[PDB]
Amino acid sequence: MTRQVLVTGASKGIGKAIAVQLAKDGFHIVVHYMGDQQGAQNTLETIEQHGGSGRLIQFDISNREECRTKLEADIAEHGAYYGVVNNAGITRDTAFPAMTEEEWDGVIHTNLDSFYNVLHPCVMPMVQKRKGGRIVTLASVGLMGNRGQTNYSAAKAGVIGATKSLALELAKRKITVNCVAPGLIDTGMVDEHVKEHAMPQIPLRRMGEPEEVAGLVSYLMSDIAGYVTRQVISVNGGLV
Amino acid sequence: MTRQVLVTGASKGIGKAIAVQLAKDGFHIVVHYMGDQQGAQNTLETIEQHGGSGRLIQFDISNREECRTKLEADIAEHGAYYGVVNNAGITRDTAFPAMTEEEWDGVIHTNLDSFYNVLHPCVMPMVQKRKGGRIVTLASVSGLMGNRGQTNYSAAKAGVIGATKSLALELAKRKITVNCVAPGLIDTGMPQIPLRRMGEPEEVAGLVSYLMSDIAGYVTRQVISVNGGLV
Amino acid sequence: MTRQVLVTGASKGIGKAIAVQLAKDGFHIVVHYMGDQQGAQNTLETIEQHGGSGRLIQFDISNREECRTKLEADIAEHGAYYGVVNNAGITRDTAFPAMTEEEWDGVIHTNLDSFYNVLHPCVMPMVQKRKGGRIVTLASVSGLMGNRGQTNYSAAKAGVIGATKSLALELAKRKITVNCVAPGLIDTGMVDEHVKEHAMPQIPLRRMGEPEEVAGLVSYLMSDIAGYVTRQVISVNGGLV
Amino acid sequence: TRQVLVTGASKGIGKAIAVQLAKDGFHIVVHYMGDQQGAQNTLETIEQHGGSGRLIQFDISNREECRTKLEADIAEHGAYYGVVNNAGITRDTAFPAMTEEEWDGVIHTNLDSFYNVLHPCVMPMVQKRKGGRIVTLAVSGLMGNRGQTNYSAAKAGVIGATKSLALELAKRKITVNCVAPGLIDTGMVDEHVKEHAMPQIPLRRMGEPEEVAGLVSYLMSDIAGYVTRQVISVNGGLV
């Protein structure tokens, strides 16, 4: 009966807004967090006070072994997830010639390897339950490239390509696979010089809110969105 | 403080499903038709059956002066639309070497010139109400990727995409989102589609519904595909 | 065997550069013009003076019947074209609310209807000659992402791209490739300078392109080794998009 | 006077590119990892037809080997004018069955490639102040796979890296583009793949390596200096 949705990074910002909204939609939210147990608990309590249901889960997304262990156990105990939302991390400009090995490797392995680390333990349980499903990845913002971000652009484009290929793979199981690509989102601590930097590039001349990303994820998660797959959809105020 | 949404081609198929879903969403639907009054009436009947509301309107999207006259009179009587859904459009499939003048022109006119004919009388009244707004055009996977026998249709729908993105840039400062919905193959009465089925009219309407919703206010200048994974 | 290539709008700028370069490549160029006869003869004289061959043709790409008559007569007399470069176009820039009927219609029916008006008389002869061929349409970055004050131009060029892809699919088995070239901002001379450096910061290369730089990509697509490139829209825009 | 590194030039597309770019007049650095026979023949063919070049060996998966060999080669001969970074061969694996090693290995070979080969080359190029050309090579467009999430992730990542680097080096008159071939007849193509793919290809034939090399030749050419940040597909209409 009940449909469970794992939301990574649901202790803060975009992941928290997604978790709250999907709980409102009726999904049993698995609120994931890395270190911030207080924030995850806050998310879950917000969910419960607005009439929904969920539970916490903890793992470090860059720790593949830990991801597998915690997810396989949570799944063995509670059943396969109907949905998996894989949220993104932050970026830091660095010009390619100046870029160090660690900057390249770290960006690639935190932003691209998390696709495998989080989704591999989750996909076949979802297939085996044969009730369809939903997978939604999120970009750091992937389609266009950006100065000083060859590593983050490679990672984000990689996620997009992995997402689309997996969409082709899982189409026959009635699991939709889509990527959401937000523009500049106001998550509460963004640099002023960042706002200053990009606001003229944004037709709507304003930052997006986390709830605005969550609305798009809520749509993709909904039953009527079952013919939408293999897509990367941007919520960026017209930036691109 | 009712919010009115014009839906062209709403007497049948995708247009009908959009009109019905948006009425369920709480919008007052202006059900447009050209000759299919019976279909339009059935749409409005269903709208009221679900507890919604709306009204009919008649014009030929290809007749620019008729469009302007009827739309401006409707806006005079009831106020400006909050949303416009530009859905009407025909196909005249054929090999390009065999394609006639009529087969080219009719497709361009009904599919692409309707952008100007329907939206031009509607934009400034929308802007002047200073309450934001929504414009959703309809294209096709054909417009994104090309398709044999559809040089005309692919041209017209790709053109709708380009016009839509431009208008998005123009109207963003009034908080009016402008987006385009590109359905794949829709069953309105197959091994190249990953989901291995045709789409349903309601599945197009669901995406139009999302775009018409208040929480979609930061999505603009987009062409979003509901196509089973074709592209 | 001589291969004829029609080049619309070849009296000036990009069309001229394409005509001159293709003549250098060895193609017999049909230099088309609408009103600018002297520019077209300038193009043909350049071609001739570097040892190439060509001939003029006149018609208005807006006038479908004139296009058909002139192209059918030229092809009846000289045989089917091997290549067609659909280059000619117009802009009528305006914000959408202020845009007139004629500013919308003129752009759609000159830039987008051109596809049918020029290519329909030319495709079946090309196919019938069973030698393969080349069709290259010219669009714009405006038709890829949209631009303020260009709902009409963006629509027409996006439409050109969609038609190009569909025709590519129809003709692929005929060994005719069909592609679209999308230039960025090209220095055609006398280009308005406010427009110019308003556009400079969007262009990574921090310069406008040269007509020869567009002609070089058309020249590549026209070449035999490009026979596996079709259904593509290729941008020459200094990294704009 | 203008040197071009061509990785994977011992065979197939890489060989075709090396041969053609040498006919265009570039001095080709013919790279190989294990296929020394093939690279020797690539260089010998170049020289027989009146061109010039030299061999270089390294494993593109070994960042250290790449850096040492490329820095040494550049120190002796000066920075490359062009770098062509070719792609490996694809493999089917359903995502559920895919192993840690299949994922990590494809990312490491097909994506980290970008850093391992290009990073030693970019700043020297910039410092020579003669402009330059970088071309990455993505096999794309096919339908009906049993899964290629890792290869498609790496190829999409290469495209993103390429476009971003294009943005960085635009000011330096260095163009950076990606070429995405369809199904190319390298002589080692599975019969099953030919059968399944051909009805999806409007041209109804595989491409020839020389048809990819012609597009690389165009991008390397001086007249192509206004083409940058692009992915250009040579695929017979596949997509």
Q: What is the DSSP string of D155-208?
A: HHHHHHHHHHHHHHHGGGTEEEEEEEE-SB--S---HHHHHHHGGG-TTSSPBP
Q: Which of chain A's residues have a Cβ under 8 Å away from the Cβ of B217?
A: 212
Q: Gaps after which residues in chain A, C–N over 2.5 Å?
A: 141
CA distance C219 to chain D (A): 10
- Residue B196 touches chain D, beta carbons under 8 Å: no
Active site residues of B: 153
Q: Mark which residues 15-44 of C lie under 8 Å from B by CB.
A: none
Q: Which of chain C's residues have a Cβ under 8 Å away from the Cβ of D239?
A: 231
Q: Which token pair is A18?
A: 């997604």
Torsion on CA atoms D83, D88, D90, D94, rounded to nearest 10: -100
For residue D95, give the amino acid letter.
F
| Pick among D140, D142, D143 to test the B interface (most B CBs inside 10 A) | D143
A158 vs D122, D147, D157: nearest CB = D157
Q: Which residues pair with C235 in a beta bridge?
A: C182
This structure's resolution (Å) is 2.0
Number of Cβ within a 10 Å radius of residue B230: 20
**B151, B105 Cβ separation under 8 angstroms:** no
**D103, D150 Cβ separation under 8 angstroms:** yes
DSSP helix/strand/coil, D11:
coil
Find where tokens 């009831």 sit. Answer: B78
Instruction: Give the closest residue to A160 by CA, choosing from B76, C59, D102, D149.
Output: D149
- The distance of Cα B189 from the centroid of its chain, to the nearest Å, equals 19
- Contact state of B173 with A205 under an 8 Å Cβ cutoff: yes
Question: Which H or E element spans position A176?
Answer: strand A175-182
**A158, D160 Cβ separation under 8 angstroms:** yes
- Residue C169 touches chain D, beta carbons under 8 Å: yes
CA distance A67 to chain B (A): 29
Find where tokens 């005309």 sit. Answer: B152
**A206, A228 Cβ separation under 8 angstroms:** no
**D231, D178 Cβ separation under 8 angstroms:** yes
Q: Work out how many CB contacts closer than 8 A connect A with B.
A: 97
Q: Distance between CA C4 and CA C27 in Å, rounded?
A: 6
Contacts of B59 (CB under 8 A, 6+ apart): B32, B34, B66, B67, B69, B70, B71
- Residue D94 touches chain B, beta carbons under 8 Å: no
Q: Which of chain D's residues have a Cβ under 8 Å away from the Cβ of B145?
A: 239
Q: Which of chain D's residues have a Cβ under 8 Å away from the Cβ of B228?
A: none
| Pick among D103, D149, D177 to test the A interface (most A CBs inside 10 A) | D149
Please provide residue B11's backbone torsions phi and psi, each rounded to the nearest 5 degrees: -85, -5
Number of Cβ within a 10 Å radius of residue A102: 8
Q: Work out how many CB contacts closer than 8 A connect A with D.
A: 124
- Residue B218 touches chain A, beta carbons under 8 Å: yes
B37-49 and B13-24 helices, crossing angle to 10°? 30
Please provide residue D54's backbone torsions phi and psi, each rounded to the nearest 5 degrees: -155, 160
- Contact state of C161 with B158 under an 8 Å Cβ cutoff: yes
Nearest CA in chain B to A229: B229
> Which chains does B contact via 3+ CB–CB distances below 8 A?
A, C, D
- Contact state of D160 with A153 under an 8 Å Cβ cutoff: yes
**B222, B181 Cβ separation under 8 angstroms:** no
**D112, D43 Cβ separation under 8 angstroms:** no
Of the listed D32, D80, D81, D151, which one is catalytic?
D151
| Backbone CA torsion sign across B122, B128, B129, B130 | positive
Q: Distance between CA B80 and CA B83 in Å, rounded?
A: 9
Q: Distance between CA C118 and CA C116 in Å, rounded?
A: 6
**A175, A136 Cβ separation under 8 angstroms:** no
User: Strand B83-86 to strand B133-138: parallel, antiparallel, or no bridges (unpaired)?
Assistant: parallel
> Which chains does C contact via 3+ CB–CB distances below 8 A?
B, D
D160 vs A105, A145, A148: nearest CB = A145
CA distance D147 to chain C (A): 26
Contacts of D44 (CB under 8 A, 6+ apart): none
Tell me D111's DSSP state.
Answer: I
Contacts of D190 (CB under 8 A, 6+ apart): none
Rg (CA), chain A: 17
Residue D169's alpha-carbon distances to D71, D163, D174, in angstroms, are 20, 10, 6
Determined by X-ray
C151-171 and B114-128 helices, crossing angle to 10°? 150
Tell me C210's DSSP state.
Answer: P
DSSP helix/strand/coil, B77:
helix
**A200, A217 Cβ separation under 8 angstroms:** no
The three-point CA angle B14-B84-B161 to 5° equals 75
Q: Distance between CA D18 and CA D1 in Å, rounded?
A: 16
Q: Which of chain A's residues have a Cβ under 8 Å away from the Cβ of B196?
A: 171-172
Contacts of C98 (CB under 8 A, 6+ apart): none
- Residue D170 touches chain A, beta carbons under 8 Å: no
Q: Which residues pair with C150 in a beta bridge?
A: C94
Q: Distance between CA C139 and CA B163 in Å, rounded?
A: 14
- Contact state of C120 with B170 under an 8 Å Cβ cutoff: no
**C215, D218 Cβ separation under 8 angstroms:** no
**D138, D180 Cβ separation under 8 angstroms:** yes
- Residue D156 touches chain B, beta carbons under 8 Å: no
- Residue B192 touches chain D, beta carbons under 8 Å: yes
Count of helices and strands (H, E) across chain B: 8, 7
Q: Alpha helix (H) ranges present in chain D?
A: 12-23, 36-48, 63-77, 100-106, 113-128, 149-169, 191-197, 209-220
Q: Which of chain C's residues have a Cβ under 8 Å away from the Cβ of D165?
A: none
Q: Which token pair is B171?
A: 């109207």
Residue A103's alpha-carbon distances to A95, A106, D3, in angstroms, are 11, 5, 30
Find where tokens 């952008």 sit. Answer: B115
- Contact state of B162 with C154 under an 8 Å Cβ cutoff: yes
Q: Which residues pair with A124 in a beta bridge?
A: none
Active site residues of A: 152
Q: Which token pair is C229?
A: 């490139």
Q: Which of chain C's residues have a Cβ under 8 Å away from the Cβ of D202?
A: 168-169, 172-173, 230-231
Q: Distance between CA A46 and CA A15 in Å, rounded?
A: 13
Q: Which token pair is B128?
A: 């002047």
Q: Distance between CA A74 and CA A60 in Å, rounded?
A: 15
Residue A99's alpha-carbon distances to A148, A194, C62, C161, in angstroms, are 9, 21, 54, 39
D151 tagged catalytic: yes
| Pick among D66, D74, D95, D228 to test the A interface (most A CBs inside 10 A) | D95
Question: Which H or E element spans position A180?
Answer: strand A175-182
- Residue D143 touches chain B, beta carbons under 8 Å: yes
Residue C9's alpha-carbon distances to B64, C74, C86, C217, D236, in angstroms, are 31, 17, 8, 17, 29
Q: Which residues pair with C186 in a beta bridge?
A: C209
> Which chains does A contact via 3+ CB–CB distances below 8 A?
B, D
Q: Which residues pair with D179 in a beta bridge?
A: D137, D232
Nearest CA in chain D to C209: D226
CA distance A135 to chain D (A): 14
Q: Which residues pair with B83 in a beta bridge?
A: B5, B134
